[PDB]
From a paper:
Pyruvate dehydrogenase (PDH) is a multienzyme complex that catalyzes the oxidative transformation of pyruvate to acetyl coenzyme A (CoA), CO2, and reducing equivalents in the form of NADH. The first step involves decarboxylation of pyruvate, which proceeds through formation of a covalent intermediate with the thiamine diphosphate cofactor (ThDP) in the active site of the pyruvate decarboxylase subunit (E1p; EC 1.2.4.2). E1p also catalyzes the second reaction step in which the acetyl group is transferred regiospecifically onto one of the sulfur atoms of a lipoyl moiety. The E1p enzyme from pyruvate dehydrogenase is a prototypical thiamine-dependent decarboxylase subunit from the extensive family of 2-oxo acid dehydrogenases.
The initial stage of catalysis is represented by the structure of E1p/E2p-PSBD with bound pyruvate. The reaction does not proceed because the cofactor has been replaced with the derivative 3-deazaThDP (thiamine diphosphate derivative where the N3 in the thiazolium ring is replaced with carbon) that mimics the ylide form but is unable to react with substrate. Pyruvate was soaked for several days into the cocrystals of E1p and 3-deazaThDP, and this resulted in density in the active-site pocket that is likely to be due to pyruvate binding (seeFigure 2 for location with respect to the whole structure). Although four copies of the active site occupy the crystal asymmetric unit, the density for the putative pyruvate is found in only two. In the remaining two sites, well-defined water molecules occupy the corresponding position. In one preferred orientation, the Cα carbon of the pyruvate is roughly 3.7 Å from C2 of 3-deazaThDP, its potential reaction partner, and is off the plane of the thiazole ring. The imidazole Nɛ of H128β contacts the pyruvate 2-oxo atom, one of the carboxylate oxygen atoms and the keto carbon of the pyruvate. The interaction with Nɛ of H128β might help to distinguish pyruvate from other carboxylic acids that lack the 2-oxo group. In the pyruvate-E1p cocrystals, the inner loops are ordered but the outer loops are not, again for all four subunits in the asymmetric unit. The pyruvate complex is not in an optimal geometry for the ThDP C2 to attack the pyruvate, and it is clear that either the substrate would have to be reorientated, or the thiazolium ring would have to tip substantially.
Author numbering:
A (entry chain C): 4 to 272, 287 to 368
B (entry chain A): 4 to 271, 287 to 367
C (entry chain I): 127, 129 to 169
D (entry chain D), E (entry chain B): 1 to 324
Write the structure that this text describes.
Amino acid sequence: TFQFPFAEQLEKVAEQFPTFQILNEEGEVVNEEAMPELSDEQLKELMRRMVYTRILDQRSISLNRQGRLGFYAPTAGQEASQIASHFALEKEDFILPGYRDVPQIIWHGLPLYQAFLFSRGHFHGNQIPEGVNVLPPQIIIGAQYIQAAGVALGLKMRGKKAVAITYTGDGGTSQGDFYEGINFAGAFKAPAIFVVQNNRFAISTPVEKQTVAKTLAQKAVAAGIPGIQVDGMDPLAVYAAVKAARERAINGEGPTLIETLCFRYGPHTENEWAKKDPLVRFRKFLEAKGLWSEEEENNVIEQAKEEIKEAIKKADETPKQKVTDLISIMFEELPFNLKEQYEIYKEKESK
Amino acid sequence: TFQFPFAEQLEKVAEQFPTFQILNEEGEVVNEEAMPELSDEQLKELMRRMVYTRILDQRSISLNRQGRLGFYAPTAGQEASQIASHFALEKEDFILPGYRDVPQIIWHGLPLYQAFLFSRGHFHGNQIPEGVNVLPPQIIIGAQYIQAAGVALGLKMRGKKAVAITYTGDGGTSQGDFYEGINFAGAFKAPAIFVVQNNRFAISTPVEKQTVAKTLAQKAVAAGIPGIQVDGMDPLAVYAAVKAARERAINGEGPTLIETLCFRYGPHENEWAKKDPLVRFRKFLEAKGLWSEEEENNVIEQAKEEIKEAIKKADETPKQKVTDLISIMFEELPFNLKEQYEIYKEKES
Amino acid sequence: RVIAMPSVRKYAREKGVDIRLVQGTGKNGRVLKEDIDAFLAG
Amino acid sequence: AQMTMVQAITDALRIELKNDPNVLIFGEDVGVNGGVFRATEGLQAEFGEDRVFDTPLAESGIGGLAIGLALQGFRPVPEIQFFGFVYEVMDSICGQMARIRYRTGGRYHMPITIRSPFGGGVHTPELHSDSLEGLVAQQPGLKVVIPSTPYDAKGLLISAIRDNDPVIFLEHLKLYRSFRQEVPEGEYTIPIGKADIKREGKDITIIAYGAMVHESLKAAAELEKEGISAEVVDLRTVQPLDIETIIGSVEKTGRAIVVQEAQRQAGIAANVVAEINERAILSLEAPVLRVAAPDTVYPFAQAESVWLPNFKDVIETAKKVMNF
Amino acid sequence: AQMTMVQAITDALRIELKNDPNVLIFGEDVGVNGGVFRATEGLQAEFGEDRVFDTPLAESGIGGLAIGLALQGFRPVPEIQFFGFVYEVMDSICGQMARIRYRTGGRYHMPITIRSPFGGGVHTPELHSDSLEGLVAQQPGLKVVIPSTPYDAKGLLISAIRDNDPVIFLEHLKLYRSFRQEVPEGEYTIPIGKADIKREGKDITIIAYGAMVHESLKAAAELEKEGISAEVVDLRTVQPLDIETIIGSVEKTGRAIVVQEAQRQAGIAANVVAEINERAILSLEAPVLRVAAPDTVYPFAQAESVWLPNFKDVIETAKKVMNF
Ligand SMILES: Cc1ncc(Cc2csc(CCOP(=O)(O)OP(=O)(O)O)c2C)c(N)n1
Ligand SMILES: Cc1ncc(Cc2csc(CCOP(=O)(O)OP(=O)(O)O)c2C)c(N)n1
Ligand SMILES: [K+]
Ligand SMILES: [K+]
Ligand SMILES: [Mg+2]
Ligand SMILES: [Mg+2]
Ligand SMILES: [Mg+2]
């Protein structure tokens, strides 16, 4: 009987997606040529933001326990994946986050207190400031992908030299909307950057249960677009990968899929990885360059705590929602039924 | 700034999906290594079935024109992709066909007259005989894929050495159920054969507007499963690909995605008339002295005739009544139907 | 006991005519809004 | 100009394409092909591939595209080949676009008009003619519109496209070319959420939408031959319901029946009934009865004529009401 | 044995898994984790990974997996983590399984039970608590069950699971473990399509389901203190409706109201009203009014309190009908 080279195909294709890295666990450069071009001040800001995001997760988990915060998905451990990738964007770029990507939209311009309002479940939390190109975190896993393709086609259509960046997890790569989103962008050669943050888990489900594909970035192959696997714990690798994808995109060459290998330090909503932490390797990196110091890190840490405390206060001073408010933001021109109901509640709200 | 080898990437993956071909347009064996082990009699039955199908298509279009048939999606040109593949299956295999895959389920056991009732829109046309493992043609593009993954896992769990085979077109690959189907089948290492018949068009949309992927077979990479691109116009290559997939599958290794490259003869000057599957295979068999114009015409007369009695059995089938439609909604009718049933039982009398 | 449309019943109630005291000259003994006007009249 | 309903739909799109550069038409086979029913015929030729284009075969992606495009300032007018396929894109419609304005508290909005054919009486295959308006009518944030004439299709579609929130535009197959009617050239609008009296009457109110309006007009003419004057009200917008028009008629007639092609457990007939019962129960001389299809899956093509409600069913139900 | 609805749930599943080897339970995180709400806790440990397993994250695929497995003689009891995610699998349920027996004229069938939690009052994030029973109540080929007590839950689920046609079992988040009740050990059943009178009354009939049942009971208690005796009917199956029990209570009270958690334009309150209007209009002293949520997208967490209907709203509406 005849036999096809099925095992070779699986290996050969996967081989096309080796893990791209620049900084290893000890903060040692290992990919000199890939080294992105960033100034000392830029590298310091990148560290500042990652340290700041860590404290935000630490505080958020805390406030969520005190009941001062509602829904919240931890982000500790994904700083490089979330922050470094955002550091590659321009203000003109449009971001479509997932329920766990509040940090990205925060650094893109969304006030911290509205991010907290988002957690509490209040409409003002999603009234993104005009000019800040983001959408509220998407709860339906996969929807942000097909929507991203649209945003991108939209930017291309208006000739803007910007991109649309969206995120999802490892489990999200099993969704139909995940596939349709990258296939459309590719089919329309739209400026989109699709990121997949692989933390090896989907709530209690290990990524092995999601698919048998050796890698996640190879899924881009189904859309015929480029894919890249990067060390999700590496700031420089992520910055560079996203930067290359943005570059490719603004020059009209299409979208790109990027898979980041990382790990969140739990929970949903091990001391081994403790050394693979992004803050650790980046700290060593900057210190050997005389670019970082405890004084600086303690400054940012306190700075984060102060602003977090103030933001949680503003969220508290936001007027409680009323049904009339909810009815009014349903349409531009309220339909008959809502006009009727608006009076019913306006009355009920009188006393 | 340095650059990622994106170009090299697309060229590399492409190289993993060359077109599998056993016979050329002139009917010459160009790949004797992968030559499928088929007996003379088997080879003839395959030619007969392909010819039979071309006739069924031609007669189906005419009968549709005369209004003696309703909904109908042409098959002319896809005989090798449809029949040869079906030929590699066993009675025990379950087929989840598309709207155009009526041929496949006919040869798997579905009486021709029911296939015609299906076209006209009669529930009896979908009352598949027991034992015959097929589902009525699926109209919702892609739905048959995720269902195929469920069917495959079922066989796996029952321990059966059978597979689940399903088909969709090029357009269908853009659907989400298409992807989810092959991914589920993959994540469960289920015995499923996924076939993508690429005739370069989805109604008026050419495959180029569907995706920028160079092959449709490479989409398998997203599921982490093997993909094969075959010459959908070569009966032997299609058979060899499916036979290979059935084997990988019943041996607990999982599913395979198969892309056949073919073309439709019109509805749903030119070229491809030389690529017609019946041409090369005919030359192939004639060179081996296994086919005569006489035999072919016997098959044709046998076809036209069986088609007539089938359209006659369809005509003689009793008209549908509302009470029937209701009776088949549930095992035990709910109140609203028990009620409506009486209402219409009275009208009907 | 029953039978009368709501228009009848709420007409009966307004006029204070206990609907159970009015017979009804409508189908199957339905109390019509004219059977109440005839209950008040006579 | 005397137009068919599909001709008026096209004219309206053409008008919007010319009137607003942001309008975009896209979907399966709507571009070069001009649509499976010729609804987008010539639109691409006149405005270009950037304004009227084809998409990959996937409804969900089409919906996601429209949402994205709307976030970038466009006025998306996507198409779903047959509404039986709405299932593939329920999230983008009901779970996303219909909620954007609300979700973003006004910061973002969705000027999206989704077009989709549906309807029985033309022997189409499975899931091609199902009446699913009942599903979308239940989602806050959407407006569902179903025209019955060339005049109404053109006016509402222009209104539908200009509206700045999601609108589902259901086009009945049997009504595409069934007849012609005089339609004003140039642009004009018909308000959404507004019905109209296709026939004035005094003995019974017959509420209907879609192909059922014609069937109701047919029953009305047969009824008039027996001295039963029926008033036929065309909803023209199934969500929101035009309460004033509907109630105003029942209060005048005292009797009413709601007619739909959809199955009894579907469609929007039950909503109409509860609203009448709620606002004019005191004017009823008989229960508000409904004319709908059996509660089974949409019929196999050959069973259509014995399953689908027609004028004969309406007359009978109207008589049941008269003789109550 | 004092059980919480969630425990009663788990027990019904345990019982079926043991009494029928064809029963399979799968979905996102329902195995080793025991489900996000412990509904399937310890089930995989007792029956194996071959019977209670996890699946990739794709609701559509889950649906197809259920359909397929069914074609192979299994009795699939898949889970959709939150009913708000039903949009991804709308075709498998409404376009597929609900139609298999009819589509194949009985040659095949779908003994599938889809479990899914919903409901407000627990501050869940977006699209978790949406009441969408209204969408599936409209698809011929399905039966939708919504229990409000541990006792009802277990008996209906065993029935649900045993039924040979697709059943949708919706589980309210706020009723999971908000109270305990005496639930009989061992297997028993409650017929589907059967209502349940939780409180005998003579003045007005209050129909409700889900969390709204307990709110109707709490309101009945207050209404009594005020001289109004309310008969509270718990539908327990929103499709098909138990007409017999509904009209019987109505023919006796002469007054009624339907109470749901869904938006007025959604849910199934409108259908109940319609059924009453055509079967017992000659008994109604006043119109049947509905208690439902405003027609806006499900409320941001913080606004659940002022948005979700409660006993106070049932009280107020019961009175309005009482003084009509
Ligand atoms: C369409 C839909 N179905 C299920 C769910 C429920 C869910 C919310 S979060 C989650 C696991 C996601 O894991 P992933 O690896 O993708 O991302 P991450 O948490 O960063 O590791 C599920 C299943 C939602 N929200 N939407
Ligand atoms: C979910 C859905 N969306 C659209 C359609 C409508 C349709 C019926 S056939 C067809 C083109 C399919 O082209 P493909 O190349 O895949 O197959 P083939 O006929 O051999 O060329 C479409 C879009 C249906 N049925 N379901
Ligand atoms: K609109
Ligand atoms: K069941
Ligand atoms: Mg993950
Ligand atoms: Mg094709
Ligand atoms: Mg989906």
